[PDB]
Design an enzyme around this catalytic site. Structure first.
Site, PDB file in Angstrom:
ATOM      1  N   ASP A   1     -13.207  -4.320 -14.101  1.00  0.00           N
ATOM      2  CA  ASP A   1     -12.303  -4.877 -13.106  1.00  0.00           C
ATOM      3  C   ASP A   1     -10.995  -5.350 -13.743  1.00  0.00           C
ATOM      4  OD1 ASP A   1     -11.165  -6.075 -10.922  1.00  0.00           O
ATOM      5  OD2 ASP A   1     -12.521  -7.807 -10.865  1.00  0.00           O
TER       6      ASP A   1
ATOM      7  N   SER B   1       6.316  -0.551  -8.164  1.00  0.00           N
ATOM      8  CA  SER B   1       6.489   0.839  -7.781  1.00  0.00           C
ATOM      9  C   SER B   1       7.890   1.043  -7.213  1.00  0.00           C
ATOM     10  CB  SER B   1       5.421   1.219  -6.754  1.00  0.00           C
ATOM     11  OG  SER B   1       5.643   2.502  -6.209  1.00  0.00           O
TER      12      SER B   1
END
Length: 330
Positions: A35, A199
């Site tokens: 994770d 992004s």
């Protein structure tokens, strides 16, 4: 040193991926959910409330000659899906894919919430976010990666998740045969303890690319792709009959649909998520309503590039002095 381990989907939907991990002496192999959005290595154990164990493999520290109680240390964690666990702490030898760390904090669960009990395939979590998020008190502990780092050939790990198929976690090296083209690297902020990046935009299907900054985290422990409501609405508007259902808890679509791809930007580079990766199947057995793999982050408070996005790429988690993230197509 290096390590290399195969990671395998737990079910036919790729809800999560499990990776075998050796703990203790002699080795006890548990299948852990790696994770990158948390920083605790915790396991089902001989200390876990018996009614809360249902099929998981447990770590039994009393059977490990290298286990030592970390006296006075406790831990308690809550995840984005509302699940939780807590317990006490041992140090022991932990190996992943041939890479060994001695003195790793192994957090033994005394209590786990229902969703963990109900998931018989996940024996615990191995956190790979920054150690500043580790929940051990009163002495915070380091992640497996942080402990391994100085010994690694290069201070990196990579995630190469499969679509309906196994993939690979590598530590300490970049497998140049595992991706196509070049890796594009992008800046990371560690201010919130995550692999947080920005992004450069998105496209839906064959549509034009929209340049827009989307701050989010690379999180292997989250199944879906959670993005701003504007972006998500633009995606689902291209699927006839798709709608957000408050009763189901997000966007659903007719199972008869063919889904468009979704592209996200990494600098000037582009990662394309095929439409099929966005299908999470019937909402209940036999239903013709299917659950979408792109969902709104509104009310999460952060955008999350979970498995839906990451499995479309070869992803480098660069833990150099100034960390960065790399993405390549594959």
């Amino acid at each position: 040193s290096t390590g290399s381990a195969t990671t395998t989907p737990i079910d036919s939907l790729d809800d999560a991926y499990i990776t075998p991990v050796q703990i203790g002496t002699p080795a006890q192999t548990l299948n852990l959910d790696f994770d990158t959005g948390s920083s605790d290595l915790w396991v089902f154990s001989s200390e876990t409330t018996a009614s809360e164990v249902d099929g998981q493999t447990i770590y039994t520290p009393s059977k490990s000659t290298t286990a030592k109680l970390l006296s006075g240390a406790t831990w308690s964690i809550s995840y984005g899906d509302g699940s939780s666990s807590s317990g006490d702490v041992y140090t022991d030898t932990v190996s992943v894919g041939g890479l060994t760390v001695t003195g790793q904090a192994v957090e033994s669960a005394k209590k786990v919430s229902s969703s963990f009990t109900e998931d018989s395939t996940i024996d615990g979590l191995l956190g790979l976010a920054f150690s500043t998020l580790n929940t051990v008190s009163p002495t915070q502990q380091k992640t497996f990666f942080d402990n391994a780092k100085a010994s690694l050939d290069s201070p990196v790990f990579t995630a190469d998740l499969g679509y309906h198929a196994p993939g690979t976690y590598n530590f300490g090296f970049i497998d140049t045969t595992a991706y196509t083209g070049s890796i594009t690297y992008t800046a990371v902020s560690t201010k919130q303890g995550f692999w947080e990046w920005t992004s450069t935009g998105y496209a839906v299907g064959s549509g034009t690319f929209k340049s827009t900054s989307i701050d989010g985290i690379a999180d292997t422990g989250t199944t879906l792709l959670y993005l701003p409501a504007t972006v998500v609405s633009a995606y689902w508007a291209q699927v006839s009959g798709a709608k957000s259902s408050s009763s189901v808890g997000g966007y659903v679509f007719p199972c008869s649909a063919t889904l468009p791809s979704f592209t996200f930007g990494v600098g000037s580079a582009r990662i394309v998520i095929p439409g099929d990766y966005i299908d999470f199947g019937p909402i209940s057995t036999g239903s013709s309503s299917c659950f979408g793999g792109i969902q709104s982050s509104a009310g999460i408070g952060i955008n999350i590039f979970g498995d839906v996005a990451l499995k479309a790429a070869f992803v480098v988690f660069n833990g150099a002095t100034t960390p960065t993230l790399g993405f390549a197509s594959k």
